[PDB]
Design a binder for this molecule. Structure first.
Ligand code: AKG
Ligand code: MN
Ligand code: ZN
Length: 181
């Protein structure tokens, strides 16, 4: 079963408000501005930015409380993504659906930080439909969730998720994916 039965965990104040703004501005300087993904994205190199460094440090410290669930992993380069009104990410898994040929570098988990939330009544929730829960974006809050089993690398299909449409304002996230070795 999933690590301690906790398919997702939410952490408020994972980044400070001014750390989120510094990261948004760095992403804008890099050019950030029916089914699947309808958003803009950019990628950060390892060590490119001190706020990325902090995401990865706190993610590692978090995973250190889960040593009985996960041994070796790698951090993917961090992605920052933006949603304008009308933009959304249709439901999907963050890893490869597999049984007997699971990739050796399968994504095992996701740590996603909300850098900027929609306006009041602005939609843009993160939906986990199988778990019957939707998380409302809040600046600085992180959502951690399990994507695949570290032993078999098969998906936890319980964490099917989506970014719902933004109705007003904008939504900016940072994705830290955790990969098998
Ligand atoms: O925007 C969201 O709330 C979810 C983002 C997501 O699922 C992803 O980028 O893989
Ligand atoms: Mn435990
Ligand atoms: Zn996703």
């Amino acid at each position: 079963g999933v690590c301690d039965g906790k398919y997702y965990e939410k952490i408020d104040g994972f980044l400070s408000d001014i750390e989120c703004d510094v990261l948004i501005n760095a992403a804008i300087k890099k050019g950030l501005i029916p089914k699947s993904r309808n958003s803009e994205q950019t990628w950060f190199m390892p060590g490119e930015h001190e706020v990325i460094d902090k995401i990865q440090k706190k993610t590692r410290e978090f995973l250190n409380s889960k040593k009985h669930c996960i041994d070796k992993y790698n951090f993917e380069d961090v992605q920052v993504a933006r949603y304008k009104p009308g933009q959304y990410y249709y439901h999907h898994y963050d890893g490869d659906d597999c049984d007997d040929a699971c990739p050796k570098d399968q994504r095992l988990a996701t740590l996603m930080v909300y850098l900027k939330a929609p306006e009041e009544g602005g939609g843009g929730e993160t939906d986990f439909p199988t778990l019957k829960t939707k998380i409302k974006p809040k600046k600085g809050t992180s959502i951690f969730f399990w994507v695949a089993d570290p032993v078999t690398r098969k998906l936890y299909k319980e964490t099917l998720h989506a970014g719902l449409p933004v109705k007003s304002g904008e939504k900016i996230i940072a994705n830290q994916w955790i990969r098998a070795v």
